[PDB]
Design a protein around this ligand. Structure first.
Ligand code: K
Ligand code: K
Ligand code: K
Ligand code: K
Ligand code: K
Ligand code: K
Ligand code: K
Ligand code: K
Ligand code: MG
Ligand code: MG
Ligand code: MG
Ligand code: MG
Ligand code: MG
Ligand code: MG
Ligand code: MG
Ligand code: MG
Ligand code: MG
Ligand code: MG
Ligand code: ZN
Lengths: 43, 102, 141, 136, 55, 142, 61, 194, 74
RNA sequence: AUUCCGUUAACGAACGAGACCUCAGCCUGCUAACUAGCUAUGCGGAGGUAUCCCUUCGCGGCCAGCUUCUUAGAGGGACUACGGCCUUUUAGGCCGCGGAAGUUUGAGGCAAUAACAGGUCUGUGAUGCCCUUAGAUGUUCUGGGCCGCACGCGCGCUACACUGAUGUAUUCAACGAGUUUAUAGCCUUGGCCGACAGGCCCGGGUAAUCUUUGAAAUUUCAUCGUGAUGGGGAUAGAUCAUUGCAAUUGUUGGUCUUCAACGAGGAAUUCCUAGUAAGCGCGAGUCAUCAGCUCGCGUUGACUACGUCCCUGCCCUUUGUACACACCG
């Protein structure tokens, strides 16, 4: 399934019927937060 | 050979519209015809409010633009030929004339 | 020839018209007796022109009141103003000017709004704020 | 003495009682399960809500003879709460109004107006006037 | 491009289906009364169109 | 009738849930998970329980009637659209699940979503909003 | 606790003009006049209840 | 004596009511001679000129003050109903004229002296100053209404009962009234900061 | 603070106290009864209705948001 | 008000201000209304003594009359006109009767000289220069993103409840907007189906002709009873409809169910002087579908002051300067 950059590989299971193919190919990388940069506070 | 001829006058200029209405009324009266009106409908005020700036900077100031349309209704109890002859009189620009029956 | 007058009271956008003619002394608004006018709290304002003058002066006139526009309070204020003006005009045009002046004086001594419309009107709102004078909250940082 | 000369609340109560006593009304099986409109949070508190609504609607048709299902939905609608969003006007259930109108027509209190909507019949005027007179 | 591909995306609605009749820009289009003019163009041509500033 | 009877019971147990006896029946039955005000109203109406009585005035038999009404909505003509578990994923039946059954169903749905690596299941696992709400500014707790 | 009637208003007083300096003549003694500072609107002919009449008012600014 | 046919709510009389305070007599409109009204709703224009609001009926001023806080703004019919119920309760409890009770409450609530901020540049200095009769009446009304609202908030007791109790306890210097306590506190502060 | 433990149903002692002293109150309202007898507002309203039916009290003026009742006889 | 009275090496002038124009406020005076109404009559229904009489509704009269109510053109009206005080016999000011109106009647539009390296090249087939110009920084198609969430800030919506929530009954606005007719496109009346969401069928309106017979707060009667409670509605599950070619990262809208913080908010800080603040809703812009936003509208309707330069700033004059990139010197 194309996610805008790559074709994520999946195998269809009986429990995924009636669902969209988009639901199994995440289009974004989950966010892991680094230390805040300059300008995050003192606003 | 008598019918209720409906005359609708539409213009943006109140002076020109009123002058045309008065001319039509006097022309109808000169022919001993029965004249009902003019009936002045509520003025139609087309309003547009747009931001003055061509961009998003500065205090949000708005320009209120209005276009006023004035409508008049005149009813004549006479024949098509006579109403046509009356309406043949010169009409200044900006005034729209519509003649119908009922 | 019919003996009648028609007088209008105003308050904001509320317009009330009282048709007062010769009769046995009934008073109805939109076909409903004035005693059932709503809200019940404003019945005092509705009846003030009647309480000040007495029912005897109204005993010889039938009044039909038609109201439109405005809100609950404005309609009642227009109703009372129209009632007062209609009674004054009827007394002027069918009753001695002395009695007309007396009723006008008693009404005005209690309240001038019973015969003079309040000219207050809603102020147009200006851009840059929610209200006519209220402006959007200002922030500097 | 007519309807216009009596308090609307007392007349509504009296006419609802009269309609219930008549026994000609055929309440739908769902009267005890539905709200009076999508804007409501709970079903009507009073078990006689159907009869009260029928009486109020009959009075409305008696006063004006050109009302329809949409008109009654607007009449009995009101503000709808949207949680954290501001309130807006909302219409009421149309099925209840349609069924009440059909029942009233069956009882002959109202009939179809040629211009559309419903109109009060002579029998309906007579019945409402007698109820108003007997209120005293 | 291929006929079935080139400009094949439907444009029956949305901002991309409308443009200013004066400048062709697709933004800030005034559709009231059928003007179909962007706000800047309308502000420029209001006097010619017949829109007067009274207040 | 204004005087409390000797059989008035202050605290009641229904599906292992404490029900206040001082509260009216309609709003006291709502203490059970899966039962709201609307469903309590309909259960009381179908069970013929007088709504003006308190949760302590009525009888254990009336409580049992309320519970059977809750457990068999179809038998009492309660429409399908009024139930909180309509068209079940596995059984495909319509019922009103309450108490621990509601928690079991919620867990089953969440685990089913997570197992297939569904986007909603992943959002639930990560503890983020699952209904498209913006998260830049709101929902800040940890 | 005495009562005094304002005879004339000298005028606004305070950094922001909050008070008004006035001259008040005592009702009990009509030949005694005292200077007072008043908070709130006040005009000639008003009557003020002085809890104590010993102090003399001075300009606050 | 002056006799007026006008009845407040068609139930109460403006006869036999007299203001017993020369200081604030001219700024209270609760007498049969000073334009009595049937209801505290008249929709007049009292802010046009200085001191004009003094002509407004005192009951009307109480009703207007009762509409504080955003949720109650503009709900004058409800305020008038609250005033009517409070006046009825006052009559029931005290057997006197409720208008007289209100007048006495205002008179006893009005503070006589205050402390005004003096100086500048972050200096906390105060000087004792007198209070004009109009400001005294305004403060009396504000304190009575604030006490009634505070008592009614988060309490089964209804606003009408709270207002009636406040007016009854203010008509006499019982010291149980919130307005009386606030007036005493203000006077104490002024005495301290003389 | 401590929550008020108002009772939704009368006990024999409280009911007797209501029947005894309530007729002698100058002002009777649901709030007054709730504060004095320590009863809920609903029970206070029911007690007011019961007393009115018994005729021991009279209605000074009734409103949806306010009910004012007093002793029938001085 | 650099508005005037005057003083005067100044005299005459030109911009700004004012005048001006738009809306609102008064006209029982003028003109005209079957695309707006009123009055009385004729007929009919209902009620009351049921014929005649009284009350209330429905329909016709282009030869029943009329313009108070509605609409919109021309005009009138206020000029501080009049009375009392203060002020230079001035310019003017305060109060007051009358008056629709006595703050410039209220609110707006328009708005001088000289400037900012303030914003806009992402409004423009406005534009110089620079870059690219076919494996394109042109154009189009597919998909994704602009919305991504340990965190900080701004404008806001909903609340913390009984001056209340819920359920009945009750009934008062204004500014506005609406179609290609194709089976039909936009506003949609009426009838039927349905609990709702929605669906089907007759039709009206290119519009004072139809939607429009057109809101909420509020009023009234009951339930609730100080309990984070029948306050609050965040979060989440199941399921059903509509728009769209496409709804998943829920487009939006319904039913049941779950029922978070929040018990009035520190330092700080915003707007506001009368139909104003605040509350309440409605129309339009965006719009195939989405308004917690903006622009307008009306409804209920206040407290306080009508004073000052204390803070923050502005105008004029005098005065000091080692400032002129002008004290962020
Ligand atoms: K977050
Ligand atoms: K309370
Ligand atoms: K360029
Ligand atoms: K543009
Ligand atoms: K200053
Ligand atoms: K200046
Ligand atoms: K120096
Ligand atoms: K210099
Ligand atoms: Mg529950
Ligand atoms: Mg006219
Ligand atoms: Mg720059
Ligand atoms: Mg963005
Ligand atoms: Mg803003
Ligand atoms: Mg209406
Ligand atoms: Mg709760
Ligand atoms: Mg709630
Ligand atoms: Mg500031
Ligand atoms: Mg926007
Ligand atoms: Zn353009």
């Amino acid at each position: 399934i194309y996610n805008g950059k790559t074709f994520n590989q999946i195998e269809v299971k009986p429990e995924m019927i009636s669902h969209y193919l988009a639901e199994f190919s995440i289009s974004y990388k989950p966010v892991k937060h680094g230390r805040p940069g300059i300008g995050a506070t003192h606003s | 050979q008598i019918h209720k001829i409906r005359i609708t006058l539409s213009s943006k200029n109140v002076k020109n519209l009123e002058k045309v209405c008065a001319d039509l009324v006097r022309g109808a009266k000169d022919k001993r015809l029965r004249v009902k009106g003019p009936v002045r409908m509520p003025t139609k005020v087309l309003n547009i409010t747009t931001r003055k700036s061509p961009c998003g900077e500065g205090t949000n100031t708005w320009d209120r633009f209005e276009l006023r349309v004035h409508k008049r209704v005149i009813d004549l109890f006479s024949s098509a030929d006579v109403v046509k002859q009356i309406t043949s009189i010169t009409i200044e620009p900006g005034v729209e004339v519509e003649v119908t029956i009922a | 020839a019919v003996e009648s007058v028609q007088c209008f009271g105003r308050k904001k956008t509320a317009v009330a018209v009282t048709h007062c003619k010769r009769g046995r002394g009934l008073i109805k608004i939109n076909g409903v007796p004035i005693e059932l006018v709503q809200p019940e709290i404003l019945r005092y304002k509705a009846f003030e022109p009647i309480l000040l003058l007495g029912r005897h002066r109204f005993a010889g006139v039938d009044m039909r009141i038609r109201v439109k526009g405005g809100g609950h309070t404005s309609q009642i204020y227009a109703i009372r103003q129209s009632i007062a003006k209609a009674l004054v005009a009827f007394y002027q045009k069918y009753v001695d000017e002395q009695q007309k002046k007396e009723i006008k004086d008693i009404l005005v001594r209690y309240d001038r709004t019973l015969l003079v419309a309040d000219p207050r009107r809603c102020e147009p709102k200006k851009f840059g704020g929610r209200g006519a004078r209220a402006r959007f909250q200002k922030s500097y940082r | 003495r007519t309807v216009k000369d009596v308090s609307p609340h007392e007349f509504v109560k009296a006419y609802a009682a009269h309609l219930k006593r008549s026994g000609k009304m055929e309440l739908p099986e769902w009267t005890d399960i539905v709200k009076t409109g999508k804007l409501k949070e709970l079903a009507p508190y009073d078990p006689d809500w159907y009869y009260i609504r029928a009486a109020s609607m009959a009075r409305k048709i008696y006063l004006r003879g050109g009302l329809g299902v949409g008109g009654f939905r607007r009449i009995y609608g009101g503000n709808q709460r949207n949680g954290s969003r501001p309130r807006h006007f909302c219409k009421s259930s149309g099925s209840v109004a349609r069924n009440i109108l059909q029942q009233l027509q069956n009882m002959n209190i109202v009939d179809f107006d040629p211009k559309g909507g419903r109109r009060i019949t002579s029998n309906g005027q007579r019945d409402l006037d007698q109820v108003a007179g007997r209120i005293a | 491009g291929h006929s079935n591909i080139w400009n094949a995306h439907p444009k029956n609605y949305g901002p991309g289906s409308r443009t200013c009749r004066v400048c062709g820009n697709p933004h800030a289009i005034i559709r009231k009364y059928g003007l179909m003019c962007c706000r800047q163009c309308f502000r420029s041509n209001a006097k010619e169109i017949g829109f007067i500033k009274y207040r | 009738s204004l005087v409390a009877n000797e059989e008035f019971q202050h605290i009641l147990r229904v599906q292992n849930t404490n029900v206040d006896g001082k509260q009216k029946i309609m709003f006291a039955m709502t203490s059970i998970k899966g039962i709201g005000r609307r469903f309590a109203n309909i259960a009381c109406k179908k069970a013929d329980i007088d709504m003006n009585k308190r949760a302590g005035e009525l009888s254990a038999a009336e409580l049992d009637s309320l519970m059977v009404v809750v457990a068999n909505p179809r038998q009492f003509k309660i429409p399908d659209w009024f139930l909180n578990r309509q068209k079940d994923y596995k059984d495909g039946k319509f019922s009103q699940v309450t108490s621990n059954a509601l928690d079991m169903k919620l867990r089953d749905d969440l685990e089913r979503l997570k197992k297939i690596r569904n986007h909603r299941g992943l959002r639930h696992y990560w503890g983020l909003r699952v209904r498209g709400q913006h998260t830049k500014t709101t929902g800040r707790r940890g | 606790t005495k009562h005094a009637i304002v005879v004339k208003v000298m005028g606004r007083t305070g950094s922001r003009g909050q008070v008004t300096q006035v001259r008040v003549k005592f009702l009990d003694d009509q030949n005694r006049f005292i200077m007072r500072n008043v908070k709130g609107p006040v005009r000639e002919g008003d009557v003020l209840t002085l809890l104590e009449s010993e102090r003399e008012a001075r300009r606050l600014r | 004596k002056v006799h007026s046919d006008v009845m407040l709510f068609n139930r109460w009389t403006y006869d036999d009511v007299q203001i017993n305070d020369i200081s604030v007599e001219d700024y209270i409109t609760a007498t049969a001679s000073k334009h009595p009204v049937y209801m505290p709703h008249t929709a007049g224009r009292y802010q046009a000129k200085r001191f004009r609001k003094a002509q407004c009926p005192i009951v009307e001023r109480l009703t207007n003050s009762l509409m504080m806080h955003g949720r109650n703004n503009g709900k004058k019919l409800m305020a008038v109903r609250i005033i009517k119920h409070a006046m009825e309760i006052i009559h029931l409890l005290t057997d006197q004229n409720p208008i007289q009770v209100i007048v006495d409450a205002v008179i006893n609530s009005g503070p006589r002296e205050d402390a005004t901020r003096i100086g500048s540049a972050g200096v906390v200095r105060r000087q004792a100053v007198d209070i004009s009769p109009l400001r005294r009446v305004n403060q009396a009304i504000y304190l009575l209404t604030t006490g009634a609202r505070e008592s009614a908030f988060r309490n089964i007791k209804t606003i009408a009962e709270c207002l009636a109790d406040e007016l009854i306890n203010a008509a006499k210097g019982s010291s149980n009234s919130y307005a009386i306590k606030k007036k005493d506190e203000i006077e104490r502060v002024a005495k301290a900061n003389r | 603070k401590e929550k008020v433990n108002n009772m939704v149903l009368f006990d024999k002692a409280t009911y007797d106290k209501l029947l005894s002293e309530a007729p002698k109150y100058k002002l009777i309202t649901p709030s007054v009864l709730s504060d004095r007898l320590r009863i809920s507002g609903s029970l206070a309203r029911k007690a007011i209705r019961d007393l009115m039916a018994r005729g021991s009290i009279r209605m000074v003026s009734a409103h949806a948001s306010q009910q004012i009742y007093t002793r029938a006889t001085n």
